[PDB]
Structures are given as structure tokens and as C-alpha cells.
Symmetry: C3
Subunit: 373 residues, 3 copies
């Protein structure tokens, strides 16, 4: 029977993973640093090193922003420094595409995976001076007229699903085939939004936005990988299922929302969706659930497995990340039982809006597994 072959192949994959993790040599190492002015260039193609099993990339981004307006200030948007990177794209040595998503979606996934705001500093009552000492992720709440602010942001670009689950990792042992990590950074057009404009992709918004400009952006890419891979009789001990599976983040935009009607976003088939993020960009307005009747995941036979009002939806998210996502951002965890259908559209994500402004749209971000072939 073929079901036993599967059982055997998965047991062997798990065994190989455990052997690799036990015997391999975990390394994190810089591969590239660069400082630039986004007025000159904002898209960069980073070439990682071809060594061992690649697990992911830590992208450090710093920036200096000057407000040269005469009188008016500017204030952080909801996403703030998470919009320093507009887009990230990874291609493996076979030129197979993995993650392609926005900076803010990648950041929200980093938060979901950590269980708390990514790389944040928790506030406590400790008299010992713990706290925001090193400003790992940091941005001034406002930039006054004539002032210059310093920003720092970190993104984890995952290939492997986690430090102990190598599903999605990349074997980069061929010298000639090239990894490609594409970073598209913010610039003076995307980062600053005037009053009344849509702040989705911007870092600061306010009456002084027209006279704000980047002084510089700097990035440093660190590559996390496993060296000194174990070797056995038949050859390198490798988890074949893990290394032949893609773990990808992607996002898309959907429109056509109308008040009091279910707006359904179908899940594709053959993808194992681990998480879903839905941002209700209600025509440049981001509200704390007040413009939604309910959200749900639905099988299409009218059976809702979790049809909830917005506050109760947020309650489940508070159990995942110990806080709320920013206004208009809704998270759905399916990690223990991924959405997996055999026929396209057998499951959908549902938002029933109560208020729909002009140009309202739903930005969907997905976390999923899929096989190469």
C-alpha cells in the first residue's frame, strides 16, 4: 500500500532532521551591508553565500529621516518602521520563488511566530534597569519641523519554518547556482503621507509630509544556516521532505466589498495555509473593528467553523501574541490544522463589513507550505 510508504518516508525525514539538528553547526554570519540614499536607488539584489542548509535571513534596516517643513510635524503611522522595507522576494538556487510579500506582512508574521511584538522590549516593574536599552526596533513617535529622527527595524526572512523545523530550508551546496534575496526599500514617495492620504505603506503622516525626506538608509543582511552537515554511508543525511517543501509568505489585495454582505476570499488548493492576515484598508481609514460585523473561516456549505464578532476575534489573537495587532489588522492561526483543500475554493475567509468607504479593499497575507512538484 502507498500509505505505508508515506509513513516510512515521513519517519525517515523526521529522523534525518533530528540527526542534522543534532550534528550540524549552526551559524549566523553577515553577507552584505550597504548605505544609500533612496532618492538614488531603492531596489537591491543580495546574493547570499552557498553553504550548508540555509534557514533564513535577518535584515537589519536603519534610516535617518529629516522633516524640513517650516512649521508642521509628522507622526508615525500604524505600521511605522515596518514600512522601511516595501517588498522582499527570495529565489533559491533553482530559481524557485519562495517568499514574496510586503515588509509589514513579514513583520506581522515575525510577531505571530514569536508570540509577542517582534523583538520588542516588555515593560515590567523591575527596579533593575532592564528595558528599552538597545533600541533594537525603534522610531520617534513624531518628527518635529526642523528635526531629524533615527529609525531601526529588523525583519526575519524565513526559509526554514523555525529553528527546530527545517520544513522550507534550502540546500545551497552547488557552487554555481545563485541565491537571490531582493529588497525593495521605502523612498520619499512611499514613506511620507499627507494629511488625508492613505497611510498604509507610509512610515510617517502629517501636515509636514511634503517636505520630509530620507537622509540615508542602511541595511545589513545576516544569513542563518547549518554547517558541517552530517554524512552517512549512502551520503549526506538530509530530510528530503523538508528540503523539497516551500515555506512561503505572500500577500494580495481584494476589492468588491459592500455593506452587510459576506465578502469571501477563497483559499487556493494544494497550499497548506498556516496563517491568514486580513487588513481592512477602508479607503485610507483603519478602524478598531467598528466597521466590521463579523469575520469567519467557512467551508462553503454554510458551516462556519469560527464566525466571530471583531472583539472576540481579537480575543483569540490576544492569546497568540499577548496584545492586539494595529487597527484594521486581523490575524487567524491555522498552524495545528492548516487549511488544506483538494478543490479550489472549498474554503474561504469571510469579512462581513458594516461600513465600506470609497476604494475599500482587503489586503490578505498568507503563510503556507507547498511542494515543489
Amino acid at each position: 500500500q502507498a500509505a505505508l510508504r508515506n509513513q516510512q518516508a515521513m519517519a525517515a525525514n523526521l529522523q534525518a532532521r533530528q540527526i542534522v539538528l543534532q550534528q550540524s553547526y549552526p551559524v549566523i554570519q553577515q553577507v552584505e551591508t550597504q548605505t544609500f540614499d533612496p532618492a538614488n536607488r531603492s531596489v537591491f539584489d543580495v546574493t547570499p553565500a552557498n553553504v550548508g542548509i540555509v534557514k533564513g535571513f535577518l535584515v537589519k534596516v536603519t534610516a535617518a529621516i529629516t522633516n524640513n517643513h517650516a512649521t508642521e510635524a509628522v507622526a508615525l503611522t500604524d505600521f511605522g518602521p515596518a514600512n522601511l522595507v516595501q517588498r522582499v522576494i527570495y529565489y533559491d538556487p533553482d530559481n524557485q520563488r519562495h517568499t514574496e510579500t510586503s515588509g509589514w506582512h513579514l513583520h506581522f508574521v515575525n510577531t505571530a511566530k514569536q508570540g509577542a511584538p517582534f523583538l520588542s522590549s516588555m515593560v515590567t516593574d523591575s527596579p533593575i534597569k532592564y528595558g528599552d536599552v538597545m533600541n533594537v526596533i525603534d522610531a520617534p513617535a513624531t518628527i518635529a519641523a526642523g528635526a531629524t529622527g533615527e529609525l531601526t527595524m529588523y525583519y526575519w526572512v524565513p526559509l526554514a519554518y523555525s529553528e527546530t523545523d527545517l520544513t522550507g530550508a534550502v540546500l545551497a551546496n552547488v557552487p554555481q547556482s545563485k541565491q537571490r534575496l531582493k529588497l525593495e526599500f521605502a523612498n520619499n514617495n512611499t514613506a511620507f503621507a499627507a494629511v488625508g492620504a492613505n497611510p498604509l505603506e507610509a512610515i510617517y503622516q502629517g501636515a509636514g509630509a511634503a517636505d520630509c525626506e530620507f537622509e540615508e538608509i542602511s541595511y545589513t543582511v545576516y544569513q542563518s544556516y547549518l554547517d558541517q552537515l552530517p554524512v552517512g554511508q549512502n551520503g549526506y543525511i538530509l530530510p528530503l521532505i523538508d528540503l523539497s517543501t516551500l515555506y512561503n509568505l505572500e500577500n494580495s489585495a481584494q476589492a468588491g466589498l459592500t455593506p452587510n454582505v459576506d465578502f469571501v476570499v477563497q483559499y487556493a488548493n494544494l497550499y497548506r495555509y498556516l496563517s491568514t492576515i486580513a487588513v481592512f484598508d477602508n479607503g485610507g481609514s483603519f478602524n478598531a473593528g467598528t466597521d466590521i460585523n463579523y469575520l469567519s473561516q467557512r467551508t462553503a456549505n454554510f458551516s462556519d467553523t469560527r464566525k466571530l464578532d471583531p472583539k472576540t476575534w481579537a480575543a483569540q489573537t490576544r492569546r497568540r501574541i499577548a496584545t492586539d495587532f494595529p487597527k484594521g489588522v486581523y490575524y487567524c492561526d491555522n498552524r495545528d490544522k492548516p487549511i488544506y483543500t483538494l478543490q479550489y475554493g472549498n474554503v474561504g475567509f469571510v469579512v462581513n463589513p458594516k461600513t465600506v468607504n470609497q476604494n475599500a479593499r482587503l489586503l490578505m497575507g498568507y503563510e503556507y507550505f507547498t511542494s515543489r512538484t
Copy 2:
């Protein structure tokens, strides 16, 4: 002789639990919503759905409170919106009671099980606008004279011990049996305490309390259960030990405290106590340990397993929920090694007070397992 029969029956139960969790698909859906004026009615009986394996109920409570006093305001008590529900009682299909406890004890257990204040929003230094966006559990610190405040509270009523441990869950396949979830809500008599009165059960206290009233109370009950239970050769694959065990929360009151003398609350026998909460209601005064010499758990043979000063007792609790329970509330975790005696009164919970005001009492809250037969 029969130790293997036990071992076998336990191995079968565990395996069946894993199969049920693996093959069934979890569902959470609304079962009842109602708005009312506590001046007319404050006791309600919710009728859950009889489907699959029932794990628990999420009770969302919203309320509007108006301070009609001319000049004086009111402020939250230590328990605040946790007293929106005064009492909860659950009857399973076979008319067996599970949880029967107060709202504040249920909330403190929800917190203990989460490892942090239930459904709270942690504060961090993140510049990304995480935080208290959705006001999942919320209540104004004060309600000024003439003002109206909005409250939201959530309670999880557990049947199953947790999402992965179905001990205590309820099989709702029986045709002739109605579950009963009984909820007693706060009213205009319990929710508001005058200056100098006992705030234990109240939501607000202050000089304006006599003229405070509910505008309205609303509740929504969600039921969490497992559907599509797996079927095997003999029939449904079910963990018989899990479904024949009761996971209950209960509360009691004890009086007779006198300064500098050990006040002992005996644990009953046949119950496997998982946690203990002791509230020192010192005649309407709730103090931060300054009225207690020490607390302990003690066996009949005179041995103290943890006789500690109140600060050190609170230190262990800080390792459990990352903060302190409100003033006068003391928590004891026995989940790894439940208090389980064969003879009533073999083990007791000890409080040695140093100050005892008139009408002092110890409100006990218990979390325990027990068998149906």
C-alpha cells in the same frame, strides 16, 4: 495485579485522545445572545447545542453603567469587570454538575491557565502600534458624576482541561438531555458599593455608588466543541477516562480566623486538586500581605511543604502569571502533583493571620479533577 489493567486502560485513553484531536475538526460558534436590564432580571439559563465533544464556553459580557449622582464619582474595585458575572453553574447532559463558582474565581483561573492576565494586552516599547487596540477586556477606571461608562468582560467556562487535554470534556450525543449553562449577572444591588462597604463583589465603589445603575447588560455565549468524531471498528474512537472525569471549579467560604493562630482549610478526599485560590476578605479590607504572618500547605503528619511569608508566596505566583493577583488574593499551583488524599482532612491549606478585623473570612477557590463513579 491490576496495575497493568490500569496502565493499559490509560494507554488506550491517551491514544484515543490523540486520534480524536487528530481526526476531528474544532468548531466555535455562537449559541445565544441577549440584552437585558438587570432591574428586571439577572439570572439566565443558556441551552448549549448537543453536538460532538464539548470543550467549553466563552462568555462575552458587555455593559453600560451610568453614574447619576450629582457630584460624586465612583472608581473600579480590585476585581472590577470580573464581577459582571456573579456566578456560573454548568450541568452536563447526564444532569451532573461540573463548574459551580463565582465570576472572579473563574477569571483568576482563566488567568492562571494562560500564564498572564486573561486576554490582557502586554505593554512593550514597539513603535509599531500594537497595544490595547480592541479593548477586549476593558472598563473605565472611574465614572464621573453624570457620566456613562462601557465595560467588556470575557469568561472561559472550561469543560475540557485544555485544548490538548480533553479531561473533563463532555460528549453531547445523547438525544434526551439538555445541557444547562446558568449565569447570574451583576445587578444594581451587587455591582456598586458605598464608601466603607465591602467591595468584594462590586464593580465600582465610591461616594456616588448609591446613584449608579446599569443602563443595560448584554451577553454572548460561544460554544467550543469537536465535530466529525472519528469512527473505528468497535465504534466511535473516544477517550473513556477523559470523558468520565470531571474538571470542576468550585468556591467556598470559611470563617473563624484569629490573630497569630493557624487557620486550616482541609482538602476533601477523592478530589485531585490542581490549584487553590484564597482571598482574605478581612472585613471588607483587602491588604497586600501585611495582615498575614504566613501561608502554607500542610499534611496531617505536621509537615509543611511550603510555609512561606506572603511576599515569597507572591514570588512563586509571579513565576506563574508574570504579575501579582489583586490585593488579598493568593494562588497555589499543584498541577504537576495534585493534592490527592484518601482520607478527608489529611492535607490542608493554612493561613496564619496577624490582623483579623470583624467579619473576616477566607474565600476559597478550587480547581480539581474527580471521577463520575
Copy 3:
């Protein structure tokens, strides 16, 4: 080869550990309490009880500090009340030394092991009055001229590695035992640093420091151990490897730093280093990474396994303890793969400074396993 014997002995050690943890009687009880004036005495030798397997000691320290200066105030140092204990040393019944380290290093390890500032109270949006109720660890941020402040501090002195890993525990059944816990407390010379002086070891610093004095210090030592050890056919069931292993905390000082040059602190051999703490005492100045180029761990010729700038180094720490350590404190976790070297100097901890003041030094704190023989 006979390496099978190891396999068997370790499987037997883990089996004996599991049996002891299941059958034994966990107890935490007070062994000594004393109030003293540090002007008279600040060094104490605590004699624990000789019962069962000893896992560790919880040291509660309270203090009253008066600022007698006429006009000036004092403010907490970065380490603050963690310097109430200057040094702690444990000797087992065989007079073998286990932990020998400073108070601040012990506290930082307690924090690393908890995953958050040790015994801290997290801040949340909860309206229920959770929070800093009991002041488990507490110290006023400043003490005004003429004012008296009250301090409370807790240290966990570990013998066993954790509550479930008895590696490092001590068997205390032999009479004529020399079990000794030595505590060297702060006094009126170490606790108070003048402006411009080195605040490393002090609790308060400021222009009023010269006139600050302890009114009193009090300590209470609790001993955590296992009673009622199980007895088998051959005799007492004991994990021989666990009880013959030392789990120690130690610290040392290192000097000879020069700008832009790698300063390497070699790891000794035969020690299994679990964690490393490095404090850059830059001549009494403690900076948030701005005086360091990068930190790293490095092999003889296998290069750097994690060569990172200070902010990225701090990012990894934020994933461990949900915040930053105080200024100048850098943490490195090696718990899953301890640094174990066949030959001395095979591995080293590296700091490359960019600014080195006079009398700069690197205070190293280590967590490690080692065998008795």
C-alpha cells in the same frame, strides 16, 4: 569500544531521575532569618539542613537605606538592588565548591532562566487590578535628602539546573556535613557611589552618596529539596550522573582592551558552558553598545559562529528574555549546544571595542556543568 556502557549509564541516570521526581516529596522551607546592621557585619555563613536531595536556595533580602545628606539626592544604579548581595558561595557536604559568583551575575542568570526579568510584574491593559501589588523585587528610583527607602530583592541560588533537571543537585544525608552557603552582603562602602565613581557594585549613586547608610538589612534563606526518596530492591534510586555533576555559576575579570582589536576571553576545557555574560565596565561608564564594534564566539580556526554588531546581539537576547539587559551587559545562550572543548582555548568569547577608557575591563559571568572526577 565499550561506549555502550555510557549509553546504558545515561539511560539509567534519566530513569532514576524520573523515578525520583515522581516519587519524591518536594519541600521548600525556611532555614535561617537574620536582621543586622552592615556597619557591624556583612558576611554570613548559613548552615542548611541535611535532608534528601537539595535543589537550591531562595534568598530573600530586605533593606532600609537612609540618605542623610543635607540637600542632594541619590538614584539607583543600573543594577540597583541586585547589588544587595555582593558575593555568594556554596560548599556541598564534601566541602566541594559549586557556585561562586556576584549578586548581579546570579540575578542575570535567574532572569535568563525565567525568560523575563526575574520575579518581575509585567504591565498590561487589564482593568482588573493586577500588577505590582506585593513588591516582590522593589527599590525606590531615588532617595531624597533626609528620606528613607525600603528595598526587597530575591536571589535563587541553584544547585540543580532546574525543577525537572537534577543535574547539579546535592545529596545531603551525611552527618558531619560541611554544607555551607556564604553570603557577602552590601555595606556602607560598596552600596553607595559618589558622582563620577564606578557604579558597578553600588546600589545608589549621586551627589548625596557620601551620607547614605543602611539602617538595617534582613535576609531569609529558604531551602528547596526532595524528601521521601524512593527505595528499590538494590537500594535508594538515585541519578548518579546528576548528583556527581556540578552546576556552577562563576565570574571573572579581564583587562587589556584596546580599540579596534579583538579582545578574546578563552573558554577553559572540560567545562560545558551553558551561558556567558559579558559586562563592559568601560572605566565606570556603561554604554548601550555604542562603544563596541561587534561581539562574537570564535573557534580556533573555524572562524566566528555568531559575529554580530551590538544591536543584533541584543536582538537575540530580546528573543530570550523579552527585553534588554542593563547598559553594558551582553548575554549569550549556549544551552542546547554547550561550549565543550577537548583542548583549552579551542573556543573564545570576543569583544572588539571602538572606545576604551582608562581602567576598562570585561566582567565575565559563566554558567557551566562539570564532573567531580
